[PDB]
Protein backbone atom coordinates (compact mmCIF):
# COMPACT_ATOMS: atom_id res chain seq x y z
CA UNK A 1 0.00 0.00 0.00
CA UNK A 2 2.93 2.41 0.51
CA UNK A 3 4.38 2.12 -3.01
CA UNK A 4 4.27 4.97 -5.48
CA UNK A 5 1.37 5.24 -7.89
CA UNK A 6 3.62 3.85 -10.63
CA UNK A 7 4.24 0.67 -8.61
CA UNK A 8 0.70 0.42 -7.19
CA UNK A 9 -1.72 -2.17 -8.60
CA UNK A 10 -4.19 -1.10 -11.28
CA UNK A 11 -7.22 -3.12 -12.37
CA UNK A 12 -7.77 -2.94 -16.13
CA UNK A 13 -10.87 -3.94 -18.10
CA UNK A 14 -10.78 -3.91 -21.91
CA UNK A 15 -14.10 -4.01 -23.77
CA UNK A 16 -13.75 -5.31 -27.33
CA UNK A 17 -16.64 -5.44 -29.80
CA UNK A 18 -16.69 -8.42 -32.18
CA UNK A 19 -18.76 -7.44 -35.24
CA UNK A 20 -19.04 -10.37 -37.67
CA UNK A 21 -21.21 -11.08 -40.71
CA UNK A 22 -23.78 -12.71 -38.43
CA UNK A 23 -26.93 -11.45 -36.70
CA UNK A 24 -26.02 -9.29 -33.71
CA UNK A 25 -26.76 -10.35 -30.13
CA UNK A 26 -25.64 -7.34 -28.03
CA UNK A 27 -27.04 -3.81 -28.28
CA UNK A 28 -26.69 -0.70 -26.15
CA UNK A 29 -29.52 0.77 -24.07
CA UNK A 30 -32.45 1.40 -26.40
CA UNK A 31 -33.48 5.05 -26.13
CA UNK A 32 -37.25 4.94 -25.62
CA UNK A 33 -39.23 8.14 -25.06
CA UNK A 34 -42.56 8.45 -23.29
CA UNK A 35 -45.56 7.32 -25.31
CA UNK A 36 -47.85 9.96 -26.83
CA UNK A 37 -51.42 9.30 -27.95
CA UNK A 38 -54.13 11.17 -29.86
CA UNK A 39 -51.66 13.40 -31.70
CA UNK A 40 -49.87 13.13 -35.04
CA UNK A 41 -46.32 12.11 -34.08
CA UNK A 42 -43.30 10.56 -35.78
CA UNK A 43 -43.28 7.15 -34.12
CA UNK A 44 -40.65 4.41 -34.18
CA UNK A 45 -41.32 0.91 -32.81
CA UNK A 46 -38.41 -1.55 -32.86
CA UNK A 47 -36.96 0.04 -35.99
CA UNK A 48 -40.34 0.30 -37.73
CA UNK A 49 -40.55 4.03 -38.45
CA UNK A 50 -43.71 5.87 -39.39
CA UNK A 51 -45.81 8.97 -38.89
CA UNK A 52 -49.34 8.86 -37.54
CA UNK A 53 -51.70 9.15 -34.61
CA UNK A 54 -51.30 6.44 -31.96
CA UNK A 55 -54.52 5.58 -30.13
CA UNK A 56 -55.69 2.94 -27.69
CA UNK A 57 -56.93 -0.11 -29.59
CA UNK A 58 -59.45 -2.88 -28.96
CA UNK A 59 -57.76 -5.30 -31.38
CA UNK A 60 -56.97 -8.75 -29.97
CA UNK A 61 -53.36 -9.21 -31.03
CA UNK A 62 -51.92 -12.68 -30.61
CA UNK A 63 -49.05 -13.01 -28.12
CA UNK A 64 -46.40 -13.59 -30.80
CA UNK A 65 -47.53 -10.85 -33.20
CA UNK A 66 -45.84 -7.44 -33.16
CA UNK A 67 -47.53 -5.54 -36.01
CA UNK A 68 -50.87 -5.27 -37.75
CA UNK A 69 -51.29 -4.63 -41.48
CA UNK A 70 -54.24 -4.29 -43.84
CA UNK A 71 -55.03 -4.66 -47.55
CA UNK A 72 -52.59 -1.84 -48.29
CA UNK A 73 -50.00 -3.74 -46.19
CA UNK A 74 -49.45 -0.46 -44.32
CA UNK A 75 -48.91 -0.58 -40.57
CA UNK A 76 -52.43 -0.28 -39.14
CA UNK A 77 -51.56 -1.38 -35.59
CA UNK A 78 -48.48 -1.85 -33.41
CA UNK A 79 -47.51 -3.30 -30.03
CA UNK A 80 -45.62 -1.20 -27.51
CA UNK A 81 -42.37 -3.15 -26.93
CA UNK A 82 -42.05 -2.15 -23.27
CA UNK A 83 -45.68 -2.41 -22.13
CA UNK A 84 -47.51 -5.09 -24.09
CA UNK A 85 -50.50 -2.96 -25.14
CA UNK A 86 -51.84 -2.62 -28.67
CA UNK A 87 -52.05 0.77 -30.40
CA UNK A 88 -54.00 1.66 -33.52
CA UNK A 89 -52.19 3.87 -36.04
CA UNK A 90 -54.28 6.41 -37.92
CA UNK A 91 -52.90 8.45 -40.85
CA UNK A 92 -51.97 12.00 -39.91
CA UNK A 93 -54.85 14.21 -40.98
CA UNK A 94 -54.45 15.58 -44.50
CA UNK A 95 -56.62 16.67 -47.38
CA UNK A 96 -57.25 19.09 -50.21
CA UNK A 97 -57.72 22.78 -49.48
CA UNK A 98 -60.21 24.53 -51.76
CA UNK A 99 -61.43 28.12 -51.76
CA UNK A 100 -65.12 28.99 -52.09
CA UNK A 101 -64.92 32.48 -53.61
CA UNK A 102 -67.61 34.63 -55.20
CA UNK A 103 -66.23 36.36 -58.26
CA UNK A 104 -63.46 38.78 -57.32
CA UNK A 105 -65.38 41.29 -59.42
CA UNK A 106 -68.15 40.75 -56.84
CA UNK A 107 -66.11 40.50 -53.63
CA UNK A 108 -62.68 39.55 -52.29
CA UNK A 109 -64.01 37.70 -49.23
CA UNK A 110 -63.52 33.93 -49.50
CA UNK A 111 -64.11 30.80 -47.46
CA UNK A 112 -61.66 27.91 -47.18
CA UNK A 113 -62.71 24.25 -47.29
CA UNK A 114 -60.45 21.55 -45.88
CA UNK A 115 -61.83 18.42 -47.52
CA UNK A 116 -62.48 15.44 -45.28
CA UNK A 117 -60.73 16.77 -42.16
CA UNK A 118 -62.44 17.15 -38.80
CA UNK A 119 -62.68 20.69 -37.45
CA UNK A 120 -60.06 19.94 -34.79
CA UNK A 121 -56.82 19.53 -36.75
CA UNK A 122 -57.06 22.95 -38.44
CA UNK A 123 -54.97 25.74 -36.87
CA UNK A 124 -57.92 28.13 -36.49
CA UNK A 125 -67.06 30.84 -38.37
CA UNK A 126 -66.28 27.11 -38.53
CA UNK A 127 -68.71 24.59 -40.03
CA UNK A 128 -68.24 20.81 -39.91
CA UNK A 129 -69.93 19.18 -42.90
CA UNK A 130 -69.39 15.71 -44.32
CA UNK A 131 -67.40 17.32 -47.13
CA UNK A 132 -64.99 18.73 -44.56
CA UNK A 133 -64.31 21.80 -42.45
CA UNK A 134 -65.54 25.07 -43.98
CA UNK A 135 -64.02 28.22 -42.47
CA UNK A 136 -65.43 31.62 -43.34
CA UNK A 137 -68.96 30.44 -44.17
CA UNK A 138 -71.94 31.33 -41.98
CA UNK A 139 -74.20 28.30 -41.68
CA UNK A 140 -77.77 29.16 -42.66
CA UNK A 141 -80.85 27.07 -41.90
CA UNK A 142 -82.69 28.56 -44.88
CA UNK A 143 -82.29 26.51 -48.06
CA UNK A 144 -81.77 28.08 -51.49
CA UNK A 145 -80.70 26.72 -54.86
CA UNK A 146 -77.14 25.48 -55.17
CA UNK A 147 -74.67 28.20 -56.14
CA UNK A 148 -71.13 26.93 -55.45
CA UNK A 149 -71.39 23.19 -54.73
CA UNK A 150 -69.12 22.30 -51.82
CA UNK A 151 -70.45 18.75 -51.56
CA UNK A 152 -72.43 16.34 -49.43
CA UNK A 153 -75.50 18.39 -50.32
CA UNK A 154 -73.89 21.61 -49.03
CA UNK A 155 -73.63 24.60 -51.37
CA UNK A 156 -72.21 28.02 -50.53
CA UNK A 157 -73.43 31.33 -51.93
CA UNK A 158 -72.43 34.96 -51.37
CA UNK A 159 -75.48 36.77 -50.00
CA UNK A 160 -76.64 39.23 -47.36
CA UNK A 161 -72.68 43.21 -44.73
CA UNK A 162 -72.88 40.45 -47.33
CA UNK A 163 -71.04 37.25 -46.46
CA UNK A 164 -70.61 33.69 -47.72
CA UNK A 165 -73.36 31.41 -46.39
CA UNK A 166 -73.26 27.62 -46.71
CA UNK A 167 -76.54 25.74 -46.69
Amino acid sequence: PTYGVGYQPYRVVVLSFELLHAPATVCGPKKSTNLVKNKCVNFNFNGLTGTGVLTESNKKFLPFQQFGRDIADTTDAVRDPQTLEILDITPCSFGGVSVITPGTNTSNQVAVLYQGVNCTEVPVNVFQTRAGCLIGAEHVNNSYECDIPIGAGICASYQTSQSIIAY
Binding site: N46, F94, V99, T104
Partner: protein, 49 residues
Protein backbone atom coordinates in the same frame (compact mmCIF):
# COMPACT_ATOMS: atom_id res chain seq x y z
CA UNK B 1 -51.78 31.94 -58.38
CA UNK B 2 -53.31 28.52 -59.07
CA UNK B 3 -55.53 29.93 -61.84
CA UNK B 4 -52.67 31.98 -63.32
CA UNK B 5 -55.14 34.86 -63.39
CA UNK B 6 -55.86 38.11 -61.59
CA UNK B 7 -59.65 37.73 -61.88
CA UNK B 8 -61.16 34.75 -60.06
CA UNK B 9 -64.67 33.78 -61.14
CA UNK B 10 -67.28 32.47 -58.72
CA UNK B 11 -66.63 28.87 -57.77
CA UNK B 12 -64.61 26.50 -55.62
CA UNK B 13 -60.97 26.10 -56.65
CA UNK B 14 -58.84 23.29 -55.24
CA UNK B 15 -55.72 25.28 -54.36
CA UNK B 16 -53.45 23.46 -51.91
CA UNK B 17 -52.98 20.31 -49.85
CA UNK B 18 -53.16 20.66 -46.07
CA UNK B 19 -51.13 18.36 -43.82
CA UNK B 20 -50.70 18.13 -40.06
CA UNK B 21 -46.95 17.36 -39.89
CA UNK B 22 -46.19 15.82 -36.49
CA UNK B 23 -45.30 17.95 -33.49
CA UNK B 24 -42.79 15.50 -32.01
CA UNK B 25 -41.11 12.13 -32.51
CA UNK B 26 -41.67 9.09 -30.29
CA UNK B 27 -39.30 6.12 -30.00
CA UNK B 28 -40.31 2.89 -28.25
CA UNK B 29 -37.97 -0.10 -28.02
CA UNK B 30 -37.85 -3.24 -25.86
CA UNK B 31 -36.23 -1.96 -22.68
CA UNK B 32 -34.99 -5.36 -21.47
CA UNK B 33 -33.90 -8.50 -23.28
CA UNK B 34 -31.14 -9.64 -20.91
CA UNK B 35 -28.72 -7.82 -18.61
CA UNK B 36 -25.17 -7.96 -19.87
CA UNK B 37 -23.10 -8.93 -16.78
CA UNK B 38 -20.56 -6.11 -16.68
CA UNK B 39 -20.76 -5.98 -12.88
CA UNK B 40 -19.47 -9.55 -12.64
CA UNK B 41 -16.27 -8.28 -14.30
CA UNK B 42 -15.85 -4.77 -12.89
CA UNK B 43 -17.06 -5.67 -9.38
CA UNK B 44 -15.17 -8.97 -9.18
CA UNK B 45 -13.51 -9.15 -5.78
CA UNK B 46 -10.35 -10.72 -7.25
CA UNK B 47 -8.69 -10.11 -10.62
CA UNK B 48 -6.50 -12.42 -12.67
CA UNK B 49 -2.82 -11.94 -13.45
Amino acid sequence: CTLKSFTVEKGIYQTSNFRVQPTESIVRFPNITNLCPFGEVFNATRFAS
